[model samples]
Target chain A: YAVNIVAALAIIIVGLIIARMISNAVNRLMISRKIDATVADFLSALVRYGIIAFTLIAALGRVGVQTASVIAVLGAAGLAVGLALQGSLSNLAAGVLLVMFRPFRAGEYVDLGGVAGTVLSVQIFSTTMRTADGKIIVIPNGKIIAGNIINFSREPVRRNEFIIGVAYDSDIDQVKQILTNIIQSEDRILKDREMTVRLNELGASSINFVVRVWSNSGDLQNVYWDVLERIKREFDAAGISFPYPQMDVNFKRV
Target chain B: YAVNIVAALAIIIVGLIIARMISNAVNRLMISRKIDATVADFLSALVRYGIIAFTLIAALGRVGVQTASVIAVLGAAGLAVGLALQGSLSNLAAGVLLVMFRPFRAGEYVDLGGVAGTVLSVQIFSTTMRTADGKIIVIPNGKIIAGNIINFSREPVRRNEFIIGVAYDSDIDQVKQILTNIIQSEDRILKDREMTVRLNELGASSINFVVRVWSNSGDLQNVYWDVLERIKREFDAAGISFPYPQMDVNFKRV
Candidate 1:
């Protein structure tokens, strides 16, 4: 009886030491990987849970307790609870996929479904965004991964497309010249990529000129607005006309 | 020895059954209370852990294991893990507080710090939000609970404060009357609360009027914008001047 007690005590001690070792291993692995705190927390919890379960089983076995029934009950309970939490489990799975794949990172600008913003943080179940206009948005990770992710920051440079309409009576050469000059004057415009200025669309009352320029990601918006403003000012100076919205009628008085 | 095995088996079976019963009871209570899945999951995990701990202790006693040393190891392990996961524990604690207090819910507009958006979902560690113009924002619950939480939906009615700058020459009474008429005319205006339109401040270039109206929480934005647009149109027709932002130049020959 004394020997049995001593052996059982030794077993419990060994089991606990193993549990501690496993927990520490998990912690060290998390630190080495440099995962976010949220992920780290979850991972460590999972590791500890498994270790604790193992420790419990071993300690109980050392005491001559039949663990088979306990295991069965646990399995049944887990299944029942899992069915109840299917939605959350899906979210957790999706979150894991997102963390691993990393479609977007913090501070990267992304445009999705016509809305644009900077990536704030990617959480276990959701992703956070900060807009250029100082607005914060949060989206579910499952929904994001399930949809088309348009990351605007993927490319080194992106083309800024601007369409400027001029009256058919105006000189196409003058309109094109103003656009070219504006592109050259602007600091943010990228010179490596050729800027295309062409009379692309012939409309009912006007000829639309498309100005396509390539610029660095940071400078894209600034160059877009500045170039448009300069085009308007320079076009007016050169006597190039853009038609205003107007109604033309013959017998309007009648 | 056979009697010892029988006693040990009986204890294990009884312990397993008790654990099952406890788990079921806990789950029923949580479901009856309608706790969120995150909270429910954590609670369930806690109950499971407790049952496992209890079973291990009982089994060890059956096998004549030293209970004191086993408890000491557990205490030390718990202390070490607790110290390591203090931040995560805080997040979990904050999350629980949010769920319990119900300061905010999904689909309501809220502002914490400078971040403003519609609450999407509250998770274990963070709250999800979607901005008005459609951006995803996630903020940690710890930060939210630790900071100022402005729940826009908690109030039954909210006052829409708007500033209208009119030319100094315009009649103050006439401006107020027009503004009042606009609010009164709007179909969306809430009749439950008082609406006040008063010329509150007189500046060098414009007279600023305060339009305070109490509207239903949901329709606050709609009513606010409707009143603003209506006032502008009516004021334009009534010839009540609105001053643009300007600086009155006072220069003397030096």
Candidate 2:
């Protein structure tokens, strides 16, 4: 009986060490294959747990315990626990999907539903995000999977759309020409992608022109600010006026 | 051998009938307690399956098939599947919570995080909505539960606000009086709620006055349109000019 107990102890200890080694091997293999860090970690842990469970059952059977009945009872209990942890489990599942599908990874700017932010990390149950305003938001994986995810950083290029308004009396052709020059002069703007400039709206105060230009993600904001400032300076040099919302008033003698 | 087979078949047949009866009973009991329909169905199915599994094992035992090893293998498979299906289970749980809490019901206009729409139905997995422009949107229950929900239809009265701009030369006191008069004249506006008309800003070209009034949800749009029209007409008659966005352009040729 003493020998049997000692052998069981040896089995458990040896099994655990092997399990750890295998888990580490799995982690390294997946990482080398370029699998997401989150997914790699999860897979390694899953493999470790699987090996541990097998070892426990084997050790129990060696000690003359009814391993079959024990396994059955444990399975039923696990199912019940799974039912109770549905919410957490769903988040885990979603995290796995996100990692596998490569929707948006760390440091990428994404709009998850309406919560626009840069991804910090995807964990077991939640995704961490850093917003434009520097606030960190922890969102459940379930929510991210359920909503429309717009990944801004996935593409190499981005488009900047601006609706610039001018006085109705201003020459449309001249205004368009100056606007085109301002955009084209920027080396950051992508020449391959389409650039569009058109009269978009006749507003109550001004004629609005819809201007769209494509630029590398890194230069998107720079392009926007430069074009706005350049257009203002160039319009002023050309004696072109920017209109405001206004109404004509006539005083009537009662 | 024939007798043993017949006895096992009888047990299986009887066990199935009992399981079905219990499942239906569980469904009705939960529904009477105001549980969500989806949850009720899920619980009943779970109970039915549990009973069926037990019956199958007992039948196998009677037939001399080793049931314990089979159950262990089945348990492992169930766990793998449970991991894969975590997302759906989480949505199911969230759906139950939504039905129980009744945050926003059908026909109510709500802002679910930033997506504003009228609630159509909350289902087992998702919430359906209809936008103001008649577009249908389906949001997962997980997303709705994880985000802030604003129910517009919850309040008895809704507030309509407008910022009316006038020429800088216009009298601030006179503008406030005209806006107040227009809002008060509209019978559709709620009398119990406060009405406010105040000078809000000294803008670039205009002195802006903020106008606000309360109205029932039913008359919110009508009051808004009428107030805007009345303000324009009233301002014109009072010789108060609306200001446009403008810059004093002084050109000096170098």
Candidate 3:
């Protein structure tokens, strides 16, 4: 009995060394592949587990242990555990999917589950977001995968829309022309896509002119604000009346 | 042979059902405590594994298999694997520690390793942070635990430091009196701490007065900006010259 215990101990020691070697090898492989930390961890875990399982089988055989019964028992137990942890497993799978397929990377601005924010970093299990108002949101990979993910910065360039409303009485042709002139001269606006000048709709307050221009995605927000400010200032100078919400007041005192 | 196979299948099924039931109970308990989703999931996993282990032991005993010999073999295998996976275990341990000890809670502003951001969320294994300038950061709980964690909003209120540089020729006594009066009048400034007004340093361009006052921790940034703006406006009104960077140029005849 003592000899059997000594043999088992020796087997365990050998197995441990092997497991460490495999785990180190996995780590090196992941680092070389430039895999994210979470993915790297998962990859290493797989290797470590495989090595340990092999060692366990060998050690048991040396002690005249029948693993057929043991494996069966473990299999049954694992199945039960797996069933109970279905949700977590799904999330783990989703996390792996996220790591493999880059929908949105770090430093990108995305609108996830109606909360808009910049992607600060991506981890194994979840994504971290920083909102415009300085709030932080950490959303799980499972939720992100299951939800509508809007990658605003996926394309190299994005279309910026500027809607300015003028009084119905104002000259549509003159407004369109002046607006075209302002954007065409600006070097920041992308020349690839011709500036879209169209009459969007006539609202109760004013006639809306929609100016859609494609610019480099990186500067879309900054350029949008800059152009809008310029248009407002220019319009005020040109005496273009932007009608505010008003009603024809019939003075019927009830 | 058929009877043996049937027995194995039954054991597996029994094991799985028991594991599921235990995991569910644990999950419900965690939910009642309002535990974090990540933590809840992890706890459920632990319970699942326990149930599975119980099932395996029961099934193997029925088959007349020696569980001890099998366990000894597995223990050896586990030791080998553990050596390789020490780093991962360290990270996992750190993650658990972070969850248990509430150093920084969600929505709190914290300064970690020179990166200042709001705590978006804390997972069992990681923490998500979002920077003030609209960037999200995902940091491992291990790294956070191992490093210096500087929480900016640990206290109910914090001090705001303003370094106002006035032209060296400006009246030091007058500037000091005006700053002291401003700190006393601002309703937002916390009265708990001493509102300090002192000549901190003599700069290259101007004389600097360090004004320190306590305010609500959450509103520290807002108060900082408000105080700075008010100081500039007040200084301007009093005809105090706040110096800009200037160069004393020496001209040579060309």
Candidate 4:
């Protein structure tokens, strides 16, 4: 019995050292794998706690205490805590996943289904989003991962589509030439990409020219307004006419 | 020695019964809380296995086997497996979260960051997506839950925005009348909702009219082309001509 006590004591001391070693090993392994830092911290704590619990139990039994009773009671304790904390654990689990998976990061605009806003801070339990209308919404990490997230700023470039209409009799060739010159003149337009200008529709009042171009995503509004303004001013100089809808309302003489 | 063996055997029998009991209790508790059925199943198994391991180690030690050796070996085994299967565990953890907190369900069209497709199935290990172009992509659940999901089919109705540019000199009142009439004419249009028709931009050659309306999601394309068609015919009959750009250069005779 004396020998058993001595051995169990040594086992605990050794267990503590091993637990620390294993925890650090896992931490480094997570780093090498490039897992999220938050997730790495979580995993290391889990490993350390698990081994420490096992060590305590092994040592207690080695000292000749009836560990079966202890084990049963521990199991019961686990059940109670697990049941009581189910919701928080669910949220906690989701939080870890959010950190690991990272659907959206800090300072990005995301449309989180009904809660659309720019991401502010992503944490363990909940995330913060700043809305365009000057309000901040706090969303649980579980809710964040449980739905679709539309990231508006993920891509650096986006296609700008324009449907410009003209009088039915306007020459398509001249209009195309003018649009091509505009495309070339715009410094922000992605010249390497396709700049499409095609006659897409024949309207009852006008001929529609569909012009699609790729440009810096941040420049969407600027390019849109600039193109429209240029089209109006340049066409006025070129003798092109914007015809108005005419309704010939004539009273029939009865 | 005989007394010790009897005690150990009794402990084994009792531990078996208690382990089963604890696992069942946990299973029912999880169900009562309405947690994900899959997560419940996983947790119950974890409890059962953990308790069972504890019982076996306790029994072995009670019967005079140097259980210290056994405990150390188990610890080493745990570390080896933990390190070797870190990635799969991370994936497994994510899988559990995915099942618990569903981002998108089966048959939903989602843009999973760069991988856009309609989800065919969500499973423990992975999810399968069928692309619009008739190809299937098998993505791990970890990857699925890690990024932003753009669920296209989640919303049943979507707003249709149209930018129609007319001649700069066209009567804004008449165009508004004609446009409002069309909006009322379309039965599929959500009349109860706000049908916005506003002069959004004054171009160099044309005045841009922005029309925003809401309708059934599936009929988006139908309403788009249909509205454009109606606008052309009605506006033409009303004598509204879509404008073309022009340049008038005066020649100086020396």
Which number leads on TM-score?
A: 2
Ranking by TM-score: 2, 3, 1, 4
lDDT per residue as tens, model 4, B173-223: 788889989988998888888687766685555688888888886787799
Candidate 2 lDDT, B1-254, residue by residue in tens: 67776887888998899999999999889878766564577679878977886786677556443355446656755776676585567767898999888779998999888778888888766787765433455677777888998998898788998887888889988888888878878899987788989999888667788878999988986687668756765776799976555566555556
Candidate 4: residue A115 lDDT (0-100): 74
Residues B183-213, candidate 3: write the lDDT tens digits: 8888888886758786655445555778888
Alpha-carbon deviation at A40 in model 4, angstroms? 26
All candidates: CA RMSD (Å): 16.3, 14.1, 17.5, 15.1
Point out where model 3 deviates above 4 Å.
A1-80, A152-154, B1-254
Best by lDDT: 2
Question: By descending lDDT, how would the candidates be arranged?
Answer: 2, 4, 3, 1
- lDDT tens digits, residue span A1-254, model 3: 56875887788888888788888888898788765576577667767866776666555555443455446445544544445344445556787898889799899999877767888777675677776444455655666788899888787788888887877888888889878887887777898785998889987656889999988876776577567656655676787866644445444435
TM-score for chain A, prediction 4: 0.58
Q: What overall lDDT, based on C-alpha atoms, would model 2 receive against the true structure?
A: 0.76
TM-score of chain A of each: 0.63, 0.67, 0.63, 0.58
User: What TM-score, computed on C-alpha atoms, does each candidate reach?
Assistant: 0.42, 0.45, 0.43, 0.42
Model 2 pairs in collision: A90-B86, A244-B244, A244-B245, A245-B243, A245-B244, A245-B245, A246-B244
TM-score of chain B of each: 0.62, 0.68, 0.64, 0.60
